[PDB]
């Protein structure tokens, strides 16, 4: 168990034991997507390191962390590569949904949204999820995968 | 066309077990196109043509039977199944109905079901390859090669003798 202190919010508890499981929990109680969460040990103020166990950062049974919610709504450019292997550039926000990106790809490519699916680094993008959940970066390349019928 | 060409195709992984390539060549330089009936069953006809001995124009029934058991094992985990948007049972009820079109979704599941590699080669005009889409880990020499053309037709391909 561990206490989480929202900044302008209040407090709540969660049980664990990685930093990635801590965020899944936080998300499973206040809905804030992992990619918008920033964490730090309370009251030390020391940022939580993403790639290290909680036990090695001074966190154990009944510790406290400060959750800071970052916007992450700053627009950015990514590539979407079509079936011919030709990419086009799209401006997006990590807060936009996959379905929204599909609408843009559809208008540019001339393919209806039910005739292609998108992937990023070997993960299919799920329509209802925010782009931010996939870790997209400026000039990241997404694949446009065609559904072929005949 | 050299043997060095078919041997050197570059496949890019899309997800585990699925690949894509954009070679530049004409189908008829390396393949024989085996034309299929042109009813709503050409996808299944093409598979049967390349996987069943003494193939006739009713062979495709075995392929569709294979696709049903495939669907039961794999449909729910397939990425195109969300494009389709039907429950496994609704999907099966449609897929098994006469002259219902086959697709990349059935090619994906069938590849798993029969442990084979299927490549669908797409051409926009003439026989000029636009893309190859590969389901499974085998190479072009061992694959079941299909041709998708005219936006809605599937034919079977066999590698010409001089390239094997």
Swiss-Prot record, chain A:
It comes from Homo sapiens. Induction: Strongly induced upon exposure to type I interferons, viruses, LPS, and other stresses, including certain genotoxic stresses. Keywords: Antiviral defense, Cytoplasm, Disulfide bond, Host-virus interaction, Immunity, Innate immunity, Isopeptide bond, Repeat, S-nitrosylation, Secreted, Ubl conjugation pathway. Pfam families: ubiquitin. Detected in lymphoid cells, striated and smooth muscle, several epithelia and neurons. Expressed in neutrophils, monocytes and lymphocytes. Enhanced expression seen in pancreatic adenocarcinoma, endometrial cancer, and bladder cancer, as compared to non-cancerous tissue. In bladder cancer, the increase in expression exhibits a striking positive correlation with more advanced stages of the disease. The gene is ISG15. One of its GO terms (biological process) is positive regulation of interleukin-10 production. A motif (LRLRGG) lies at residues 146-150. SMART domains: UBQ. InterPro entries: Ubiquilin, Ubiquitin-like_dom, Ubiquitin-like_domsf, Ubiquitin_dom. One of its GO terms (cellular component) is cytoplasm. It comes from the Eukaryota. The record marks 147 as: Interacts with activating enzyme. One of its GO terms (molecular function) is ubiquitin protein ligase binding. This is Ubiquitin-like protein ISG15. Both the Ubiquitin-like 1 and Ubiquitin-like 2 domains are required for its efficient conjugation to cellular proteins. The two domains play different roles in the ISGylation pathway: Ubiquitin-like 2 domain is necessary for the first two steps allowing the linking of ISG15 to the E1 and E2 enzymes while Ubiquitin-like 1 domain is essential for the final, E3-mediated transfer of ISG15, from the E2 to the Lys of the target protein.
Swiss-Prot record, chain B:
Changing residue 130 to T: Loss of 40% activity for debubiquitination and 75% for deISGylation activity. Changing residue 79 to D: Complete loss of deISGylation and debubiquitination activities. Residues 3-30 are annotated as: Essential for the vOTU enzymatic activity. Changing residue 18 to R: Complete loss of debubiquitination activity. No effect on deISGylation. Unable to block RIG-I-mediated gene activation. Changing residue 42 to A: Loss of deubiquitinating and deISGylase activities. Displays RNA-directed RNA polymerase, deubiquitinating and deISGylase activities. RNA-dependent RNA polymerase is responsible for replication and transcription of the viral RNA genome. During transcription, synthesizes subgenomic RNAs and assures their capping by a cap-snatching mechanism, which involves the endonuclease activity cleaving the host capped pre-mRNAs. These short capped RNAs are then used as primers for viral transcription. Interacts (via N-terminus) with host ISG15 (via C-terminus); the deISGylase activity of the viral protein interferes with antiviral signaling pathways mediated by NF-kappaB and IRF signalings. Interacts with host ubiquitin. Classified as His(+) endonuclease since it has a histidine upstream of the active site that coordinates the first cation. This is RNA-directed RNA polymerase L. The gene is L. The chain holds residues 1 to 162 of 3945 of the full protein.
